[model samples]
Target: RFLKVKNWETDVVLTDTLHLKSTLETGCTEHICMGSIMLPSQHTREDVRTKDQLFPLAKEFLDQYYSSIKRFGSKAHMDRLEEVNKEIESTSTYQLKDTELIYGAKHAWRNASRCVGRIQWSKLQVFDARDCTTAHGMFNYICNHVKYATNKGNLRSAITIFPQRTDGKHDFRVWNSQLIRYAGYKQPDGSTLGDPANVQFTEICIQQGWKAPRGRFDVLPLLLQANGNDPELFQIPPELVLEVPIRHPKFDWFKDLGLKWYGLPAVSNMLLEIGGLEFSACPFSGWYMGTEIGVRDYCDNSRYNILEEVAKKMDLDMRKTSSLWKDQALVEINIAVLYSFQSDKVTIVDHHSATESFIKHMENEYRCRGGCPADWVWIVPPMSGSITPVFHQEMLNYRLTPSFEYQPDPWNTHVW
Candidate 1:
């Protein structure tokens, strides 16, 4: 299942089944790109069953697992393949050992093409929650993750993997986009009070019987699904979440804005695919990139839209376009995010420093693997464009196995 797609002037090549075949084409052409798996007709659905589909996939992963440990051609490796075959023959599914599961999750982070922070892939802390059988169980593990990862504002990268998908149904899912996110209240006049992106999820939480606090930065509760039932909502403990108040070293007025953000950016809704097995409810979290909060969260028009507010405070004439007022605010905003996190002793990376490590990561990947697939749109920092080292580098965007993929929002696929 190897594909041989040649390269351009850059000569960055993609070979082998793991790199070539993982990104199943979705009618994307050179002129334009088709985005997102959540379509009207086909949302996130996994149906790879039957002896025909399962055996080859199982063998592929078993080979990958054994080879990763330098035991590919040994009897120990071949016995694994036969054992997996026997398991598939009887139960239509096989289990992953603890060693295999941890290896798979870390490799999944390393193979995530859109992430620019793969340099820390090996530093992941994993919680194997495969024994979880209910929404209540999910809440306990997630709470444990929040407490462990928060670490009193010193954030840690981690994930909690629930059971794998079986029966092409009865999938487990965490409905929120992230483990910790602020609530967004859509006002009657079309204004959003908090993070505007979370309006829909907040409404869902409210409809599911969460008391509406209506605060500007109220943390939302967890929406968990086990065995594909209607999702249950559980409020996260207030003390477990570590938050930081945004401030600038030079600007005294910055603290008056009352800006704050959570320390850990734990993503809860992603599918972890390893050796053909899918963990639908694997919540993985890394720390934060300064621009992720500075540019997108604070300044994006769709988000809090605080650019003009901060610009006005900085004494910039909003009417003048060429004065570079927005640019100035953007710079100071990023500075404030980094400064605030640093002062709080929280783990965060500035864009320049982030790209430097990524450059190092690129060199290491080229030396280790044949190629590293990256989406330039994502790796490029939102704040500064051309100055970052990654801006000059060219990369191929292709999916790799043992990687993360977007799944349908469990609410959309629910029968209820």
Candidate 2:
């Protein structure tokens, strides 16, 4: 049996922490989360700019992100889609389990940039939805901006579709016979209209039978990307690229109902899936790769990091904007904190309430624990048993301030 300790490990945290004064520096310490509020401090700006200096860092981020997804793109990897349509026929069912169904992976993997792919969205006969515009534009840029040095030409691109379709006049089929009909559409008027024809959202990959390798989740593009970071890197109009229904400006009318026509019915079942204007309507996270360049980074001091900067540059603000930014911030914080805490072996006494309390207390604060989890994040924590700031806030004052001098390499190591 495992030994149980009490006092919540709070007292034993060894808080010989750093002295962090609530300063105007706007640095992204473990304490102050700049990425959450889109308010970048000097420190935050430095990290963001460092990443920006890397050539095609955005593309790097995209490739890394997609590569992670590719690992789980196969029928065996998608529990979410598999559970949703267990009985439906799919390209998944056609192949031998070991043979690997390339179509199912491209048609089902949902990158954070899933909506960025090109679709003939304007082809909608009933509801002309512009919701896919943002996503489409994103894909167009990534797909089009291929240079020889970067894209290597012959780079293959990938997309995911629900209720996979295979019907197309040319050999290129977009409608799958077995699954298209079951997936329905939500009309622009806020009414649900089942796909009478069960239309297919096609899977288009360039290399013949180029299935992603096992445990690899990305689909290499046929054309190289001109720029890697901009979610809309390739840049082209919906009409120019492919043949499908085009998005209607009139579909803007339907923005109120919180829906997108992804040629899937199951998407609608998830509550809170489609309300954000940027997420559902445009569908792109402008920041590329790991760089915190977009409005979502509250702590990023990038040119477009400020609220007004986002409004002027991106034409939006978190204040009046959809929950896309909010959700993103939450996810980022959870990832950072959870991973850090887990690494430091900080067990949450009660995950639900402890998480709520932790975020609530840190919401907008600019200081961190500076030890344990804080050190894991490369920042200092608050002093142990001290309710006030450390003697000095500089790294030189390591003794006076609460600093956990932990090395970042060898991620498996425990610094606490």
Candidate 3:
């Protein structure tokens, strides 16, 4: 069942691996280029499956995979991998009962350089236990459970004629299918895809567009939308809009440069700062709250400032018109953490391994996407002030932090 092709592309890898010589094959072996799986070894045997059950299967999975694909490596390397996988599965009987086989197999498959940028095993365990939901779905759960977030985050997929990146780049239409499938929501035909002969609705929308802080870029919503409108709720565009710079071959000589044009807004800049960090704004931004929780909370409250800035340039009562934002006072904070190369001396060429340890804690423990523009916060230090809601009759005295007022004697205070 092993494929003869030397370079195995990921898209076809799964298909070729399973079809290798065995009609009896059902499960699959996977490259662990990312990181280890967290499930315990005992979990695999819970259903009367054997160590032999997952090992040779995983080996054949990788062997056929590496040998058939020219892209993975040459035959010599392929043979080495074959031998390694066999050794892994063959000697793993004792370890298989205690360790995570899937993880072991991953280590057996992909090399370290390919996976240095991997995440925590615990995080992967959480994801794997949740089934194979797209990364979007996982973040959606975090939003609801952690951020108290609301809005409909949904996804729909169709077969694409081209490659799909795990990273967000290609539009859903790249994988657009001609067949009628469920958009994202299931249909009433009682069939999973409802007879597979109807026009499919692959478009998806996130209803909570307003939750985005003002000044935040709408890339995520833009990508999520089928149409660009208020609340950013709409269908996907029928055709891709590929804009070109002035230097492009298609630049027109006759086009007027100074006209007061009336059309779709041209995108100019998309950078937002929260706390000390800057982030690239997107629909998915609100969901990835981490150690930057302080920053995220501030941005959620800073929509008003964005409105006022935009209002100075345009004719609009953003307060009354844009429900997504509100006016607010601004604040800033900056602190530096400096480390020395040596215990007693500092040198230009010296490097410290401890610096890596610090960032490791930040990425894994802090969960901060520290450098991303939108995922950051800018906090205004606490002070006493009145910030009005112009439309409502309410007068507001706002402080950046909470106030401490009083304490009472137990004898004088009533329980009621």
Q: Give me the runs in candidate 3 sitting further than 4 Å from their true place.
A: 1-57, 60-124, 129-212, 216-416
Q: How do the predictions measure up, each by TM-score?
A: 0.92, 0.17, 0.19
Of candidate 1, the 10-residue stretch with the lowest lDDT total is 36-45
State residue 58's C-alpha deviation in candidate 1, in Å: 1.7
Candidate 2, residues 1-416: lDDT per residue as tens digits? 11121123242212323223221233356676443332232211101112222223222222332344575455534443343234223222211121122221221222111121112211211111212224343343322321210122122232221121112111111112211112333346854333222211112221223232221111122211111111111222322221111121323322232221111111111101110000111111110111111122222332112233223332234675574554444333323333332333322122333223322222212123232112112111111112212111211111111110111111121111
lDDT of 1: 0.83
Lowest summed-lDDT stretch of 10 residues in model 2? Answer: 269-278
The lDDT values for all models are: 0.83, 0.23, 0.22
Question: What are the clash counts of all predictions, listed in order?
Answer: 0, 79, 33
lDDT of 3 at 241: 17
Q: Please list the residue runs of candidate 2 whose C-alpha ends up more than 4 Å from where it truly belongs after superposition.
A: 1-10, 17-187, 190-370, 373-416
User: Which candidate, 1 or 3, would have the higher lDDT against the true structure?
Assistant: 1
In model 1, which regions exceed 4 Å deviation?
1-23, 26-48
Better of 1 and 2 by lDDT: 1
